[PDB]
């Protein structure tokens, strides 16, 4: 491209349906090798990672680069949580416990103090500075690989009976039975562990 966007800060308008146009700002994390129209984005103040075709998607308005990519932190501590099952503590009403079982997947690209994490009851991709949670006591560490899967189309049958269509876009290095799937009808990155029973309904082509 004339100008790269991976690793850059970006802003764009968002126009979905007939809601008033809003402004989004974020950092482009990655351009998916197997589908380079698709980018993973971390938006300011938004926990879940977005997968958006930033150039093709009609909802993305007036895309701008706010600043270019720049150069790149206890890595030993990071390595003790990467690939581990965890209990991740959030707050419910008036500071009560709201504890979620999950899996720390990786350090995020670009934003290296940030970690990829997903949850057994909510298997989509999130990003947090988990060493802060850890140091505060809010992250407890707890006590199926397929050849040639990247780029494969995937579907499962929804309750509605229709097929939900997507593509496998990434394998997690620290846990190689774990893959990222992007479905056509949504912006989340779905995270499936093919060793788990929760994955048995996926059909690949």
């Amino acid at each position: 491209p004339r100008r790269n966007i991976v690793g850059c800060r970006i802003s764009h308008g968002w126009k979905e349906g007939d809601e008033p146009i809003t402004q989004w700002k974020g950092t482009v994390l990655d351009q998916v090798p197997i589908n380079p129209s698709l980018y993973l984005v971390k938006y300011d103040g938004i926990d879940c990672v977005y997968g958006l075709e930033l150039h093709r998607d009609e909802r993305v308005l007036s895309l701008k680069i706010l600043s270019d990519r720049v150069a790149s932190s206890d890595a030993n501590l990071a390595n003790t949580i990467i690939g581990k099952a965890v209990e991740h503590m959030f707050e419910g009403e008036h500071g009560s416990k709201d504890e979620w079982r999950g899996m720390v997947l990786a350090q995020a690209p670009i934003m290296k103090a940030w970690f990829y994490i997903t949850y057994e009851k909510d298997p989509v991709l999130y990003m947090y500075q988990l060493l802060d949670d850890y140091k505060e006591g809010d992250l407890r560490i707890m006590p199926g690989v397929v050849d040639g899967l990247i780029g494969k189309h995937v579907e499962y049958t929804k309750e509605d009976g229709s097929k939900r269509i997507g593509m496998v876009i990434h394998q997690v290095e620290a846990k190689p039975s774990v893959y990222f799937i992007k479905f056509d009808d949504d912006f989340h990155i779905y995270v499936y562990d093919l060793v788990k029973k929760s994955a048995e309904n996926l059909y690949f082509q």
Binding site: T22, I46, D98, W100, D138
Partner: peptide
């Protein structure tokens, strides 16, 4: 600790 987010 953090608080879980809703959709916008």
């Amino acid at each position: 600790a953090r608080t879980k987010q809703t959709a916008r």
